Amino acid sequence: RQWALEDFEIGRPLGKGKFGNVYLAREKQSKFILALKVLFKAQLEKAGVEHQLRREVEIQSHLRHPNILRLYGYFHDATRVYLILEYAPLGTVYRELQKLSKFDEQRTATYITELANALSYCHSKRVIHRDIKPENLLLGSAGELKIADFGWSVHTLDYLPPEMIEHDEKVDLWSLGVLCYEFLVGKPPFEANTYQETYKRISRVEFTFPDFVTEGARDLISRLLKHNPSQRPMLREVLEHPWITANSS
Numbered sequence: 210r211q212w213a214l215e216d217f218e219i220g221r222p223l224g225k226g227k228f229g230n231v232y233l234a235r236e237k238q239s240k241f242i243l244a245l246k247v248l249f250k251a252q253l254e255k256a257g258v259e260h261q262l263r264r265e266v267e268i269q270s271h272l273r274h275p276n277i278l279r280l281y282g283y284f285h286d287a288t289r290v291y292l293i294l295e296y297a298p299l300g301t302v303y304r305e306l307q308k309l310s311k312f313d314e315q316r317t318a319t320y321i322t323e324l325a326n327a328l329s330y331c332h333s334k335r336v337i338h339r340d341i342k343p344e345n346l347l348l349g350s351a352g353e354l355k356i357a358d359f360g361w362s363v364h365t366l367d368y369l370p371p372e373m374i375e376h377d378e379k380v381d382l383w384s385l386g387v388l389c390y391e392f393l394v395g396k397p398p399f400e401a402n403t404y405q406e407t408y409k410r411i412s413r414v415e416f417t418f419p420d421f422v423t424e425g426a427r428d429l430i431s432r433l434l435k436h437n438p439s440q441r442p443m444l445r446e447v448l449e450h451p452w453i454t455a456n457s458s
């Protein structure tokens with residue numbers, strides 16, 4: 210189905226990005242709610258990424274898990290391009306997170322699992338995201354976890370493993386590692402004040418749990434945060450892992 214801007218009304222702007230921004234919008238015929246990524250041909254050009262968006266659409270489209278954000282369609286005009294996206298009412302995890310400091314274990318566990326399955330499905334198609342971070346995981350109405358923004362979902366550093374900063378489905382695991390940490394602590398294991406400062410920390414795997422990071426939580430994160438990609442688990446062992454198991458939903 211070939212679209213056109215004139216088909217939707219426009220609610221508030223959910224966010225504003227470098228390349229454009231996202232407005233709440235409703236489809237005029239079915240009165241259907243969704244988010245609507247808006248981006249500028251000019252801006253995409255001047256940074257040369259017409260590809261990540263051939264290859265974000267070619268992808269997100271082809272995909273259908275609960276925990277992944279369904280890209281419904283696409284179209285463009287003279288100057289900008291429109292992505293017709295699913296809409297997650299409860300906002301981003303990032304906001305949830307900084308909104309309330311850190312997450313309890315259950316909450317964390319859950320997300321991770323969902324995340325994991327979400328991931329497990331993706332890699333079932335040997336697809337890897339490589340852009341995972343709280344500000345890319347949204348919350349559906351039921352409060353579910355949806356993963357979005359496929360800038361670099363092929364086949365700032367806080368979340369990227371060594372392999373990348375210097376890769377197969379491994380990459381993600383690592384990030385999942387980082388991600389878990391933040392969730393429980395409030396910051397990424399390597400948060401550094403300086404770009405180059407970080408690279409160092411990440412390159413060398415220099416993180417340290419506060420006392421309250423009880424349990425094989427501490428374990429799990431270590432288990433994940435390996436420099437040797439081939440030595441991280443798989444989602445299976447992960448959802449399986451007790452601490453997840455005991456706490457997840």
Ligand SMILES: Cc1cc(CN2CCN(c3c(Br)cnc4nc(-c5ccc(N6CCN(C)CC6)cc5)[nH]c34)CC2)no1
Binds near residue numbers: 224228230247299347
């Ligand atoms: C270009 C560009 C990228 C972005 C980043 N966005 C990606 C995700 N965005 C949303 C998408 Br796509 C789908 N559903 C969304 N729902 C929200 C949302 C919902 C509620 C709230 N509030 C704000 C006010 N309040 C205190 C309660 C919670 C915030 C966000 N965002 C969604 C948008 C951002 N931007 O341009």
